[PDB]
């Protein structure tokens, strides 16, 4: 895919510099290609290798090693990566089975959000009348000043609503004018994005207040582990 071409890392090290921090952390790559996909994880990195865990089945083991343009993403704190790669072929690492790659000579390193997210907790509700009168309940999941994320009924992206509850409990209960911008999953658990429209100025600064103090509030327990 493509994104914002100042998302693209070309220079050997540049791409390499995000590698090694997959790595590190071990973060979870997630490898697709045409008809399957499998989780696994950078084991070790080179300049001239990339070295992969096997995957847990057998079958997309199996299924990996004849494809070819494998897309690998990876979700990282503050950033989405991605690339791809032409071919994996087997390998053994620590004497256990391996993928092993060139890497990729360029690397998506996706920044996209202009706002801070933090996560919901002890749930908070969510509730919103249909076009045909029933009543769609969610758990919220997180929040940033432009959205919100939530938790599970048939519908659609592009679908804009207008009056949606939001109890947060001890805090309050609030409304948006929201659009369901992505549907996707989330464990087997359906996800919902929702973008609000017509925030006023009088809104962002209660969105604002509490955004920070949930920040807060994690900080100050946190301190408490001590
Ligand atoms: N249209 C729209 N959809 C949204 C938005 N936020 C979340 N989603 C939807 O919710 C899915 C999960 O988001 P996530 O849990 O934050 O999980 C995300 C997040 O960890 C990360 N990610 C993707 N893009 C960015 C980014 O631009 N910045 C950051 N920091 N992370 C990103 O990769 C994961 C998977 O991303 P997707 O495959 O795109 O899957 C996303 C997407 O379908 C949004 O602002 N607009
Ligand atoms: N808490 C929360 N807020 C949400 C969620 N989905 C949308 N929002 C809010 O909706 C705003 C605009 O969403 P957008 O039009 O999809 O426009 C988004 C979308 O095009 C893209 N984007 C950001 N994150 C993701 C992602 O994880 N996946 C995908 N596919 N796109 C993303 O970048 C644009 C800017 O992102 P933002 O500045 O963060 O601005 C986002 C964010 O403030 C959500 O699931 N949780």
């Not at 801070?116 to 919220?140: E, H, V």
């Not at 949930?214 to 582990?225: G, T, Y």
Request: charged share 20%; proline share 5%; with cysteine.
């Amino acid at each position: 895919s493509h994104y914002h071409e100042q998302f693209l890392k070309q220079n050997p090290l540049a791409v390499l510099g995000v590698l090694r921090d997959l790595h590190k952390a071990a973060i979870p790559l997630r490898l697709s290609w045409n008809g399957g996909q499998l989780i696994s994880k950078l084991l070790a990195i080179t300049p001239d290798k990339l070295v992969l865990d096997f995957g847990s089945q057998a079958e997309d083991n199996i299924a990996v090693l004849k494809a070819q343009h494998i897309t690998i993403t990876a979700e990282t704190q503050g950033a989405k990566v991605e690339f791809t790669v032409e071919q994996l072929q087997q390998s053994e690492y620590l004497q256990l089975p391996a993928f092993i790659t060139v890497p990729p000579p360029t690397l998506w390193f996706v920044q996209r959000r202009r706002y801070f997210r933090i996560s919901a907790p002890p749930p908070y509700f969510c509730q919103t009348k249909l076009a045909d009168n029933s009543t769609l309940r969610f758990r919220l999941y997180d929040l940033s000043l432009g959205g919100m994320g939530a938790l599970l009924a048939e519908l659609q992206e592009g679908m804009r609503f207008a009056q949606i509850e939001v109890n947060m409990g001890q805090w309050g209960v609030f409304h948006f004018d929201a659009q369901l911008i992505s549907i996707s999953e989330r464990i087997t658990t359906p996800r919902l994005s929702f973008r609000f429209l017509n925030v006023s100025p009088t809104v962002e600064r209660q969105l604002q207040r509490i955004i920070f103090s949930l920040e807060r509030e994690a900080r100050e327990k946190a301190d408490k582990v001590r």
